[PDB]
Amino acid sequence: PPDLRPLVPLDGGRFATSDLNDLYRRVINRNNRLKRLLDLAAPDIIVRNEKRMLQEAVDALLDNGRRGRAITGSNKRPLKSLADMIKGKQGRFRQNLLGKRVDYSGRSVITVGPYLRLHQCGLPKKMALELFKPFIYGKLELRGLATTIKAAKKMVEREEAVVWDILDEVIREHPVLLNRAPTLHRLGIQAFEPVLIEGKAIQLHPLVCAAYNADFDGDQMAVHVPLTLEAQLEARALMMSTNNILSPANGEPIIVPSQDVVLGLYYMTRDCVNAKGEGMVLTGPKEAERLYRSGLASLHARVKVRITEYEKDANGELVAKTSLKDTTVGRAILWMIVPKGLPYSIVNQALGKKAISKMLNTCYRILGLKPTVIFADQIMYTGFAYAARSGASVGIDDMVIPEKKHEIISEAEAEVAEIQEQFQSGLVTAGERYNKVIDIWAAANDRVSKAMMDNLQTETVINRDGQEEKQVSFNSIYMMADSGARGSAAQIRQLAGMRGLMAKPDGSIIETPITANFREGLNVLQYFISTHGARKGLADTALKTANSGYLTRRLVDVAQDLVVTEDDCGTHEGIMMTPVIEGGDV
Amino acid sequence: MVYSYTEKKRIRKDFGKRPQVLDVPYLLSIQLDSFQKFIEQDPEGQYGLEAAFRSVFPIQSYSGNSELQYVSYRLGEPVFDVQECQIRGVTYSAPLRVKLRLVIYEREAPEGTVKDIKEQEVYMGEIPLMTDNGTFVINGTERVIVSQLHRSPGVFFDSDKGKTHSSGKVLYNARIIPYRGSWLDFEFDPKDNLFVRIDRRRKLPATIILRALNYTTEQILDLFFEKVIFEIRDNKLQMELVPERLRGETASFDIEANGKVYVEKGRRITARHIRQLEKDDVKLIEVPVEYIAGKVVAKDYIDESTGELICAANMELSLDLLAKLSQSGHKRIETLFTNDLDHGPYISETLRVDPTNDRLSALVEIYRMMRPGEPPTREAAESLFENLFFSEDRYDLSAVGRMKFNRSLLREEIEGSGILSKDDIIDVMKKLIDIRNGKGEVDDIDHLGNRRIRSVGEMAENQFRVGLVRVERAVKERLSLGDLDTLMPQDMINAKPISAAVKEFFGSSQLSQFMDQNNPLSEITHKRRISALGPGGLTRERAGFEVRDVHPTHYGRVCPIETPEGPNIGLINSLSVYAQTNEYGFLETPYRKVTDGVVTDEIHYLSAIEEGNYVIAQANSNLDEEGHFVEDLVTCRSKGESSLFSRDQVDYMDVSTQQVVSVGASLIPFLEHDDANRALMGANMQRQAVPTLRADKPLVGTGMERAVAVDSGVTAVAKRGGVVQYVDASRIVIKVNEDEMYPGEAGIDIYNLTKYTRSNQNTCINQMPCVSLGEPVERGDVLADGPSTDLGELALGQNMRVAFMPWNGYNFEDSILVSERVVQEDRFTTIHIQELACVSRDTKLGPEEITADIPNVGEAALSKLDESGIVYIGAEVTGGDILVGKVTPKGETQLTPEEKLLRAIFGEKASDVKDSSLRVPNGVSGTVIDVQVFTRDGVEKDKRALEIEEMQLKQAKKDLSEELQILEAGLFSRIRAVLVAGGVEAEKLDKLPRDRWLELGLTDEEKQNQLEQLAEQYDELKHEFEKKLEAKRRKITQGDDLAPGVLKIVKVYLAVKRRIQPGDKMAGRHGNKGVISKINPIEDMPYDENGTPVDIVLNPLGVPSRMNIGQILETHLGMAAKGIGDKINAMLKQQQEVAKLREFIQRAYDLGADVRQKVDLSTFSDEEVMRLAENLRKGMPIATPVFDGAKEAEIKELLKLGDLPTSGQIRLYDGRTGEQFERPVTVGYMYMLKLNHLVDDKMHARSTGSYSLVTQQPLGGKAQFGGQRFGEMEVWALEAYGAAYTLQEMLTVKSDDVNGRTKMYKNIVDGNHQMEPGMPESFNVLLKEIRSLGINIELEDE
Amino acid sequence: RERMGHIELASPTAHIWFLKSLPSRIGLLLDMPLRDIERVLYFESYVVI
DNA sequence: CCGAGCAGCATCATTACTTGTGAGCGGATAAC
DNA sequence: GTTATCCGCTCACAATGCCACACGCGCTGCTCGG
């Protein structure tokens, strides 16, 4: 039809001559010419060749691909065949049938705004006003304040505060969908009850941004309002974030406090030996909280507090043991959040990241769902609060270099030195020499790493009413690492201690590793080899992204039909699931 | 001591122990040097226009003895100029005129001409010159062509390790690639058989081409195999012997010589057996006849009287055939050495496979091969072959091609033929056969010595020659057909294809692109950019995971850091700082010529392979102050490696630490404390910075600012030194120093500073004059900072007081929290300038009209307009509003003359109006600041157009008026100081004004004579000024070129002042990107115990993971810098005595351990010291080189100089609680940019609006107010949940099913939520499209 | 948007899809080498019927 | 006469290092 | 010779998603046309 192959003009007599029109022109021209020849006495060879040419033309029209090319003029590129309008990522299938460009909602960049609860999300006033414009007109007409759509447009164009509180009411429960750009797995799209904020950004709860694998490096998110009633109730029932805490891949909790909150708690649930207030007795967590807020005691000093850890002994019951436990005011304060469930023994430790995941998981297992989402919200709130109250900060003198490292190097250095003699005197073969250099360097690397750790993890030396004690370090670094907050020791020892060996482009290992570190500079060559490694990694990611995309597409296609339909097939054939063994441990 | 008249304003304190030897070269060496290579009149023909000419010329006729050759060329002059071309929208053209001669030789006679016409300067095309910023000005915009990087045209050897036939059959193919022509290759069969082949055709049995070169099978084998002669003695089938020959493999029998039994019975000839056999000096062996088993014979055998072959060349030689030939002769027999270790019988086996054996047969074979289905005849195959190679026209290896070829074949002549030859082919074959053997060695394709760069110059002349060969063919045929001698050598050529080719290259090429012109650093790093894509180059899809890697030969040659993260990594590199292109196109790097023990300042520009052969020291290797390494086992690099060596084991030291990183990377402070995997994104972000209102110096800089600023074009560098006669907000007028000006030409020069002007990314560029008045500047100084530049130092972002601590999670992952103060001070509020062009076509109904009147819209929508429709300059427009103002001829087919005649007089202006005005796209506000107008001549002008014309006329007249003032003053001074000589007139030239000095009466011989002289001079001066004024008048008021029927192109400019706000993107200089997350009030922010708040609150947890400790160090140094600053501030708040401040600043500058610079502050005049101080109150800038940074001990010393604690950590007090934090936080002064990813360009929504025509789906793009692409993966994520109704309505009623969506909109406005899913219109589209083929497709009944 | 047109091809002609999409449906249908059907469509040979 | 539209064009050799894989076909290679 | 067997070569067929922004998209000696 003429519609589906439109001839759209330009500012002047310039028309976008779609390839279909041009191919049709060519083929119909050949047809007319050939017919006119057929009536005109038909020289045999000529009609033969013209039939061949017409076959070629109709061929090209059905498919510019086979038998050669029919590239367009002035643009050395083929013409869009009919088949082209079907196949490829541009054909109607993968372009408008399966995934069609929606019309109804929004797009922006995101920020954090952690004041909001887990199910909420930010929303700019401008985007909101633009989206629910139909609901706006509806609420205005039903309120009679504008009984004509024209006046409704005028009012929404003038933003009289009436429109503002009308909008506030109209989205009071109206869920919406936040969507990352590449939606890898089921969580890539989720729902939230929006709230109105200023600016143009999209605030959202932190935990769920860790869910999307959504960093805040400027990553844009799309929004989608579900409009029909069935759809809204659906989005509230299924894809609202508060109903997806267990990742469908693995039943592990997907909402895990990742960073900047785990640090807070870990700092709170720690124990400085002799801090201000050690040795008191506290009449309850609220008591110790009052004590700490008034600055009369540290946030983490050993004390004795009475606590009533509620317990679900039998189903439905709740016993209350008003025991007298020895803890720290940090843990005493944090206890004010657990919802009458978990025993105290889950808060008494250093409370690292894995410990937080454990806490959330046992809370969910024991107390259903709603108390757990409340607990998670409170955990995030208090974590941010006490992190800010902490003031954890990384200064240059924090990452203390293990002083003996130098010596160690020289030793290993001197080591490889005489090994070169072993080769310069031909007493040992070349390959074994290479392996021996590698091995002495690896041993020196492990020794310097253990030196850095032993000088870092327990560097603190303090005194309790007396001589001296050795407690775990309060350094900024290793308060992020040991907490599991951000980056493991495999990066710290790379920072403070020796960076170690690095890889050749092929994968081989250079003889001389990077004796240097990061707190100390690097000689040019050292940075060069580090660049080798880093660029290899980056290229790997840059290709694997597209490769994995194509792979998961083939996957979702080959299994897009399996839907659990029957309830029990009633069979007996099973596979013998066994605890796997690989030659090492299980 | 050597400080410029500008450096004295702010002398940057600098660390860096290493005293640099070679200053940073002109950062735009590539573009300028190469375009000079291309454009200048080269008398050598090695390259440039002359080379392309010598190639294409002399054109010859159909052997009609009428040739057309050249003698030389020349270039016209730009009719417009860079600002003229840049505003009027025309390319910076250059007329090309060539000196040709069409000679015709008499016939039928020997050579000589009886028919000839000389034509010099026939016009052929117009090439765009390179403006002095190393860029080009295509029509309107300013494009730049990046330098390409492609495999050196030549010969090399690939292995293809086991990736075929999967049995360790690595085939060492060898390919030869020319600078032009169809390349060639040889392959090893997976069964060890050679195969000559063309680019991609059927694999031929190799020896074919040897037979094609007129080779006899005898001579064939004589070029790849030995000759184990058999001087048949009286008995025993004698032969020669060298024990290496029989070394080989297992032996078969005792090979006794002279009777002495060396080879024991059996096998396993031992090295000791070989050794004693060599000891005996053996020269013969009795031999059993059966020993000869394979022994393929070389000489073909024929009886002495039968003529027939009796033993054919290269078939076999064995018992039967030997006994057979021994019934005729003989006395000579020779065969071919054979072995699996060496001298494999590949040539012989291929000749076995060889289909043809005759030369002409070989030519017809290759004739069918290259192009099948065609008549194989002798002459046709011969022409095809000897014009496939051996043809200077259709082939040329290269100059550098010949060089690389000869070197890769261990040849001697460094320069030779640019064309193949039989010896070169057989040498390639021989070396290849060796490569199959243990001998030789393959060479990679990533070694920089094999990949040459190729600038804009060579590529431009190549496109020139390519577009030239076609007009060459055309003019040859037109000279053939047409009358030989009836014409002038002026029209047989058609320059339209030449212009088309060159304009298509410079305008629409994969490499050409308008400059990334939003940031001086971005611009620079975009000029010296190396790519591997584009023509001749590989593409990113099939790029291969390998090539992207960095190769140890890159060190110092191409940056390993600066690289666009994304699909094209490694394929888009940036040239190193000190690097340079070779005379061929290779990458040379400067080194220092290490002599016996001295590291002399003598530099050498080493090539790649030259570096490979030598040993290279390390830049960081400290020295004993006399060229001698302090250490003894110094680290070094010899052959793509790293190892220690003795001080006498080295030959070349590095030149300076900086030569490894990019020019952009060079700008990164404390790089050596940072990891690459983050410094990369740091460099990228630095490229994507954005200019601000008042850019300021960065505190912690890398000293590279001077170069990157001045070597760019953004700063109006003073050309010739002098005194600042007159400054202004837009114009500078420099009176030249009395020496550096020509005898005439008072030549007081004028710098016209470009005011707010659009960028290729919609960023304002504004040069404010940084210089005072009356101050004297020397040659090559700064007179106007460009966008985001200060005092001639690259000033990208802002130095912000910043602390590293969490803050209620408002900096949760990496988001950045700021203080309303940073907004109130406008520290980041930037500008954006965007243009809107309303065009006026000429439809067949009639041309357009820009009349102010509009039939339908009211005065409210018209009030912003003038009588001419175009808006007043400065009217604050809002979205949706109408700028112009142009209506259109709407109707047709009325055909009522009785009304047409009415509306011929009453309505010819009011017949078919249709208001196709230009409205500002809804969403963007802004102030109009400028209106450019382009008119089609004939149509006079608009009142706005005429007004702008006269205004620009007056502007340009002002400068000539100034020059007239100064020349008039000089000449009247002359007439006074000369008229005095007599009269006397020494009291009337000064109280009586200039009324008639030219007419004052005195003596004649010289005095009235001098009056006559200066009268004629003054009058001709006025006259030439009038003439050039009229010339500017014409060049300004003349119409412009507008080809496709366009009358009035009205461009309007719009300036928006976009302030910072949540959602924007900010990043330091260490890849620590982030999104501004909250405009926290000034008081709520943390504040130091002296009251001063902290501006930005970053997130510390980002550091350990990202492993970029550098920034942290910088932060410390930052505070230290600022420390000094406030100190001086105190010294300036109260009027402290000068000498005190002088000594203090001096001591501050002498704080480093061993720094390269020793400023004295003596010979600084007092007010110069005060000026310097006033430019330091906001913090002493600190320069640290890239890889010689200030060790933290010096930072501690500096902080100690200030009154700030050494730990770089200060207690705080939350403005909310009022209490303190424990764990003293780290706070300093970090540099912070702002990227052009600000949220205003992203946030947009869509309730309902436009829809595509081909499918009733909504458009896409904020520009089109479109929706979002709910793509495949979103569909899958939905259907993973239940999400049935949601996905349903989203597919049908949200954005399809016109009836359905209209019903939805009409039903929801009535407060009812219900879907009416019909049919996706795109599905109807698919059905109709399939049905466009014979594929019937219906909907089932049920 | 729906009215489809049609063209009277002055001479019959082959549908590329059934003729070249490996395996050639025509070829399999006739037990004929695809090379032959190709060479006879493009007027270069003669098929006897 | 000369500008504006226009009708079917490989416009010679317009070349073109792989990307990785699968399927099929013409022809070498071996059993009956 | 047949008969099928397998193999080298040829040719078709796949290349993450979004976005955003930018740029650009007949011609040319026949045809017509007055």
Ligand SMILES: [Mg+2]
């Ligand atoms: Mg991101």
